[PDB]
Design a protein around this motif. Structure first.
Motif, PDB file in Angstrom:
ATOM      1  N   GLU A   2      77.986 112.333  16.901  1.00 50.87           N
ATOM      2  CA  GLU A   2      78.924 112.573  17.997  1.00 50.87           C
ATOM      3  C   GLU A   2      78.594 112.047  19.389  1.00 50.87           C
ATOM      4  N   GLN A   3      79.654 111.876  20.174  1.00 51.83           N
ATOM      5  CA  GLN A   3      79.581 111.361  21.537  1.00 51.83           C
ATOM      6  C   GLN A   3      78.765 112.226  22.484  1.00 51.83           C
ATOM      7  N   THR A   4      77.797 111.610  23.150  1.00 55.72           N
ATOM      8  CA  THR A   4      76.936 112.324  24.078  1.00 55.72           C
ATOM      9  C   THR A   4      77.201 111.966  25.542  1.00 55.72           C
ATOM     10  N   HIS A   5      77.481 110.694  25.814  1.00 54.59           N
ATOM     11  CA  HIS A   5      77.709 110.270  27.187  1.00 54.59           C
ATOM     12  C   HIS A   5      78.942 109.426  27.373  1.00 54.59           C
ATOM     13  N   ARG A   6      79.148 109.025  28.618  1.00 57.57           N
ATOM     14  CA  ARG A   6      80.275 108.212  29.025  1.00 57.57           C
ATOM     15  C   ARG A   6      79.742 107.219  30.069  1.00 57.57           C
ATOM     16  N   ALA A   7      80.022 105.933  29.893  1.00 58.42           N
ATOM     17  CA  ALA A   7      79.557 104.945  30.862  1.00 58.42           C
ATOM     18  C   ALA A   7      80.392 105.092  32.130  1.00 58.42           C
ATOM     19  N   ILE A   8      79.761 105.011  33.298  1.00 54.87           N
ATOM     20  CA  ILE A   8      80.501 105.148  34.552  1.00 54.87           C
ATOM     21  C   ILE A   8      80.564 103.871  35.387  1.00 54.87           C
ATOM     22  N   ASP A  17      68.392  92.646  24.046  1.00 57.34           N
ATOM     23  CA  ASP A  17      68.418  94.064  23.701  1.00 57.34           C
ATOM     24  C   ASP A  17      69.358  94.951  24.514  1.00 57.34           C
ATOM     25  N   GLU A  18      69.958  94.409  25.566  1.00 61.67           N
ATOM     26  CA  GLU A  18      70.848  95.204  26.396  1.00 61.67           C
ATOM     27  C   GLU A  18      72.209  95.355  25.755  1.00 61.67           C
ATOM     28  N   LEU A  19      72.829  96.500  26.010  1.00 56.48           N
ATOM     29  CA  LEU A  19      74.135  96.869  25.479  1.00 56.48           C
ATOM     30  C   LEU A  19      75.250  96.695  26.517  1.00 56.48           C
ATOM     31  N   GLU A  20      76.333  96.011  26.169  1.00 55.12           N
ATOM     32  CA  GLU A  20      77.434  95.837  27.118  1.00 55.12           C
ATOM     33  C   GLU A  20      78.195  97.157  27.335  1.00 55.12           C
ATOM     34  N   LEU A  21      78.612  97.429  28.572  1.00 57.16           N
ATOM     35  CA  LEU A  21      79.342  98.661  28.876  1.00 57.16           C
ATOM     36  C   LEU A  21      80.565  98.451  29.749  1.00 57.16           C
ATOM     37  N   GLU A  22      81.673  99.070  29.351  1.00 63.54           N
ATOM     38  CA  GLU A  22      82.924  99.041  30.108  1.00 63.54           C
ATOM     39  C   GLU A  22      82.955 100.435  30.732  1.00 63.54           C
ATOM     40  N   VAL A  23      83.693 100.630  31.816  1.00 67.67           N
ATOM     41  CA  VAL A  23      83.724 101.967  32.387  1.00 67.67           C
ATOM     42  C   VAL A  23      84.471 102.896  31.433  1.00 67.67           C
ATOM     43  N   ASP A  24      83.996 104.134  31.332  1.00 63.54           N
ATOM     44  CA  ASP A  24      84.589 105.144  30.459  1.00 63.54           C
ATOM     45  C   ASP A  24      84.362 104.885  28.974  1.00 63.54           C
ATOM     46  N   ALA A  33      64.307 107.010  26.622  1.00 61.86           N
ATOM     47  CA  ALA A  33      62.964 106.516  26.899  1.00 61.86           C
ATOM     48  C   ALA A  33      62.392 107.069  28.199  1.00 61.86           C
ATOM     49  N   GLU A  34      61.066 107.088  28.290  1.00 60.25           N
ATOM     50  CA  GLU A  34      60.375 107.593  29.473  1.00 60.25           C
ATOM     51  C   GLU A  34      60.375 106.614  30.652  1.00 60.25           C
ATOM     52  N   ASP A  35      60.822 105.376  30.431  1.00 62.84           N
ATOM     53  CA  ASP A  35      60.859 104.375  31.499  1.00 62.84           C
ATOM     54  C   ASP A  35      62.259 104.232  32.108  1.00 62.84           C
ATOM     55  N   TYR A  36      63.113 105.207  31.807  1.00 63.47           N
ATOM     56  CA  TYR A  36      64.475 105.276  32.318  1.00 63.47           C
ATOM     57  C   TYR A  36      65.550 104.416  31.686  1.00 63.47           C
ATOM     58  N   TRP A  37      65.341 103.992  30.449  1.00 61.34           N
ATOM     59  CA  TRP A  37      66.366 103.224  29.765  1.00 61.34           C
ATOM     60  C   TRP A  37      66.889 104.097  28.623  1.00 61.34           C
ATOM     61  N   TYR A  38      68.128 103.851  28.213  1.00 63.29           N
ATOM     62  CA  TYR A  38      68.738 104.592  27.116  1.00 63.29           C
ATOM     63  C   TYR A  38      69.020 103.647  25.962  1.00 63.29           C
ATOM     64  N   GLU A  39      68.686 104.086  24.753  1.00 59.23           N
ATOM     65  CA  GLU A  39      68.954 103.311  23.542  1.00 59.23           C
ATOM     66  C   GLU A  39      70.201 104.041  23.046  1.00 59.23           C
ATOM     67  N   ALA A  40      71.318 103.331  22.948  1.00 59.08           N
ATOM     68  CA  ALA A  40      72.547 103.968  22.507  1.00 59.08           C
ATOM     69  C   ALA A  40      73.448 103.087  21.663  1.00 59.08           C
ATOM     70  N   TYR A  41      74.487 103.724  21.137  1.00 60.71           N
ATOM     71  CA  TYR A  41      75.485 103.087  20.302  1.00 60.71           C
ATOM     72  C   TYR A  41      76.813 103.188  21.052  1.00 60.71           C
ATOM     73  N   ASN A  42      77.441 102.047  21.316  1.00 59.64           N
ATOM     74  CA  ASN A  42      78.720 102.036  22.017  1.00 59.64           C
ATOM     75  C   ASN A  42      79.814 102.257  20.987  1.00 59.64           C
ATOM     76  N   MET A  43      80.451 103.421  21.029  1.00 57.19           N
ATOM     77  CA  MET A  43      81.494 103.737  20.064  1.00 57.19           C
ATOM     78  C   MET A  43      82.781 102.924  20.188  1.00 57.19           C
ATOM     79  N   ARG A  44      82.978 102.232  21.304  1.00 63.64           N
ATOM     80  CA  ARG A  44      84.181 101.427  21.443  1.00 63.64           C
ATOM     81  C   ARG A  44      83.995 100.057  20.800  1.00 63.64           C
TER      82      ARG A  44
END
Lengths: 60, 60, 60, 60
Positions: A2-8, A17-24, A33-44
């Motif tokens: 399930e969905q945990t976050h929303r890109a703003i 390795d970077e993930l593309e993000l659209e708003v919302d 991660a402890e270095d301030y990056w998030y490993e995630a799956y873009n559901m869109r």
């Protein structure tokens, strides 16, 4: 799962390795991660990758 | 030259071209790319590099 | 209840329903409207109201 | 006249005098009030109004 976050903010990758993000964009963060990056799956777009922590907010 | 921005979030690089940022770090942005990244000089650490646009704010 | 966000920019109201914000003000966001405004309680001034979403960041 | 700023966050009005903003919208700021609001003309929509100062950045 399930969905945990929303890109703003809009995020356009510059590295493999970077993930593309659209708003919302719905995100399923798999690791904070402890270095301030998030490993995630873009559901869109159905894509995995990492992105700067501050670009997303939890959904609750 | 002179200070243009101030970092507002902590940014830890993962790639060679990225610039490390501490909160409240003085920045001299040399270029504002069209893909939303900033090429800047960190006046506290004397280092050049790129970082996600939303991590900094102008100083005015 | 508990603190959810922190104001990052100074916000001075112009309308009755808007909430005044000082930088680093503790906020308890009670609702995240779909039109990008936040209904929150300012824990420093003990005041309720709304403000533009981008003026605050979650605390985690 | 000419373009002075660029909107960086999405802003949806709630009041009559507020100006709608899309990200990357060209703006001609006509006044920078002392209470942190900007009176501007949106060159994409041809509309005048006010909005929170931090939603726009100068173009230089």
């Amino acid at each position: 799962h399930e969905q945990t976050h929303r890109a703003i903010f809009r995020f356009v990758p510059r590295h493999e390795d970077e993930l593309e993000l659209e708003v919302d964009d719905p995100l399923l963060v798999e690791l904070q991660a402890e270095d301030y990056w998030y490993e995630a799956y873009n559901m869109r777009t159905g894509a995995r990758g990492v992105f700067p922590a501050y670009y997303a907010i939890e959904v609750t």
